[PDB]
Structure 1
């Protein structure tokens, strides 16, 4: 029915701890396997942290909240799926004795966790090092981190090219006191949109500056390059004009039928004359173009592209600047698309496309992927997304954090230094985060096969007296420097990991009752 007071606190933490345990083996390159036993006769050995959490049912709503944490993390950044779940679980576990044994009110617990987050975020910055995100060779070395140990490792040179050039193009690199400061906002999902075209190989892929349109044209043989581009965007089709009111036409003599046909031709021409009056070079219409209109416009020295939705016209307008006009007759001479390099209408893979590649960077691009089959096109896309996620995380901040558990251990040590200076009851739940952070270097040792106490103690001592670049060697299990053994990760991931882990723990810790009802 309901679980009240300490029943909610124990139940929420208990479930979250169970979720954390599921994936403790998923951390590090030496991650161990789990056997997922289906209600059917099958069994899955897949060790992907996301799949394991997805494909295993959970009972307690608190466990479902933990699942939402991983889903949010996946949307924010390309990694941390298991970090936020393991860390959030340990934070709850560390807060458990404080709710029960110390009888510390949840309000006190939450306040300290917010303060511990603020301090943890500072430390993650302090221990990080810059990289020159404008040095393409340095960026290629970073991007490969998410490409190796995969079949497509031999593509990594092209995958880095595609990822790096596209994200640089869309990065909103701007600052001023009037139009505001985008602060290097990157949204690859909307701006780097990728299109897959049959034919060629991975090496033939290209990043375009403009819009890649999948719609065909009125004639295959039209100008491909224009010296002074002018672009028209229209909704209304080019067809016989009809009135809005009542019309009654009564024909007795057959001779007058030809007069009606001549009028029908004129009305179509008149629409085209208004289009041609403003000297266009490419006309795009959402609705269709009559056979007469097709010839009327082409003979005027322009190309015509048909069946392009408002959604595409909005993209075309961003890269051309052309204004969308509903009615053909209202087209204005101010509708232009100049400084566009091509209107190529090439048929690629036995499919017609239209390219608006230009010399502009209006906060957007398109990646064009080539491949000899749909499987190749999907394989390139699916793996490229990993490269693009890293390119986003790196280009969004030049600071890289040390891996191998080094960053998390540095937060543990530095929080301990501040904890001794924190007065009041909040000192206790404050320590909870300091200890919880060590779940990462601890788990890495366990998955490597070392001693979780003797190696973790030595690791802590190295950070306590020495530098914050000391981590765990994923392959050997030994304590090694993270500069000699580069395992560096973008700060963006580490900052969001600790941020969302503590916030998620707070969401469960502050709930002292679960009640049923509809």
Structure 2
């Protein structure tokens, strides 16, 4: 197709106009006095939300250049939420602030590459200052507190999360399910988790979390690339008769095979999801057998001469639940015999003794930790179904917050950590004046979150920002109560991972956009 090509300043304003629509739409929801955004759906009454992520996904613009601007920031800002479970809105507001001031500097005739180098240097410095400011979260008391604060001052949730992490450890796998009554439950079962997400976003059946949940699914384990649907017809038909959903773990599922499975699930003739097998090379083959023993299936390797057409139900493994998101796949309560699993574990602990390399023993130690460790399952209870679903959501949300808090600690929330760190970097310089401006752009952008929160509350951003800079440490402005004090004590905090991730991702896309000289897109019509 014939393309529309824009250059230089003409192109960069277009992108800025686009990011502004995204940012301005999402940033109204920021802080304790955040505003509602109304999202239209033409099947019923419109949605009213204060979720910046929900707003962001809806944003698509007519002007194709403006749209490209919005989609770039969306893409990168969403990676903040993937990592830490929060800070897409923050990342978007930061991105807007860095780009705006960055482009002002470019128009003033400063070198884009130096501006980027200055921004990046300010960020690297700021991240270390966040490390320094961070309060650790180690003991189970602290864990319960962070879980409580994350779950809207609900102490039951803090206790649940603390008890769960006490059983399977800090780096254990924890799941949340629907409860079967009033009482909460906690059980550890045979399970596993590997870092491979869905191969298509159209598999998502729980759009709120952005995840694929399969109840009592069969699991296909193939040691090959599936490109055609021809070879999976006898297996798909055998799964349809049993009327159970199917997970496919293969080397890759692409081309016609992927497309057919995407459409079938959306029509709803068979519910299916596909993920890549974990790892690569020889280690992949080994981990594909680990899940085989766990689920009680057999790997269909074409290497020793097995075909997918001669795969029956008995070859597929099964679990009680599978949960897939953009990055991770969790397998919950496999039907593997304790004999087979404990044998596989003993077999790997044999190989650790015979291992020559340190790299080999740490990789084998990962695999044993998965099989031996299992998975914790929290079943959230409540009086009604409505309360149960609501609490579950808060538990999942607080779980991700607490996990992040354990990794990197907590810092003052309400956009205070960023403004604190920025105030400590006044004397930071670069190689030239252009880089110095790049630094000052970044430092000034780190105030954007606080100011927006304060603006939503109806207070003067400049005055509050001014007072917060006056203090030191985790002293800041509680936007909810309109009082100053220790932010951690007052219970207004963010995981350090959230604030860090939000800043680095924001600076990533901002840096790229500032150093863009050309854009290519399809023609208006």
TM range (shorter): 0.5 to 0.7
Q: State the Cα RMSD in Å.
A: 3.8
**What SS does the aligned partner of 1:417 have?**
coil
**What SS does the aligned partner of 1:468 have?**
coil
| Cα offset, 1:143, TM superposition | 0.4
1:494 is aligned to 499
1:144 is aligned to 148
- Mapped pair 1:206 → 2:204: no
**Aligned with 1:86 (options 61, 82, 93):** 93
CA deviation vs aligned residue, 1:39-76 (integer Å, no higher than 9, x gap): 78954432211112223433421101122123222211
1:258 is aligned to none
Q: C-alpha distance in 2, partners of 1:125/1:319? A: 45
2:438 is aligned to 429
Q: How does 1:192-341 map to 2 (within 5 A)?
A: 192-196=174-178, 199-201=180-182, 203-211=183-191, 286=297, 309-310=316-317, 312=319, 320=338, 322=340
Question: Is contact 2:77–2:502 with CA below 8 Å preserved after alignment?
Answer: no
Query: TM-score, length-normalised on structure 2?
Result: 0.62
- Mapped pair 1:406 → 2:386: no
- Mapped pair 1:505 → 2:501: no
- Runs (5+) with no aligned partner, structure 1: 174-185, 217-281, 288-305, 325-333, 339-358
Question: Is contact 2:216–2:319 with CA below 8 Å preserved after alignment?
Answer: no
**What SS does the aligned partner of 2:413 have?**
coil
Give the stretch that moved more between structures: 12-21 or 136-145: 12-21
Q: C-alpha distance in 1, partners of 2:75/2:378? A: 33
CA deviation vs aligned residue, 1:101-138 (integer Å, no higher than 9, x gap): 2x12222222212212111111111222223x12x222
Question: Is contact 2:380–2:392 with CA below 8 Å preserved after alignment?
Answer: no
Q: C-alpha distance in 1, partners of 2:437/2:316? A: 60
Q: C-alpha distance in 1, partners of 2:150/2:399? A: 10
CA deviation vs aligned residue, 1:480-500 (integer Å, no higher than 9, x gap): 332552312221111111111
Size of the aligned set, in residue pairs, is 373
| Cα offset, 1:36, TM superposition | 4.1
Question: Is contact 2:184–2:379 with CA below 8 Å preserved after alignment?
Answer: yes
1:386 is aligned to 397
**What SS does the aligned partner of 1:425 have?**
helix
Q: C-alpha distance in 1, partners of 2:432/2:521? A: 40
Query: TM-score, length-normalised on structure 1?
Result: 0.63
**Aligned with 2:53 (options 50, 53, 69):** 50
| Cα offset, 1:162, TM superposition | 3.6
- Mapped pair 1:104 → 2:113: no
**What SS does the aligned partner of 1:45 have?**
strand
1:77 is aligned to 84
Give the stretch that moved more between structures: 377-386 or 162-171: 162-171
Q: Which structure shows the higher strand fraction?
A: 2
Q: C-alpha distance in 1, partners of 2:21/2:431? A: 32
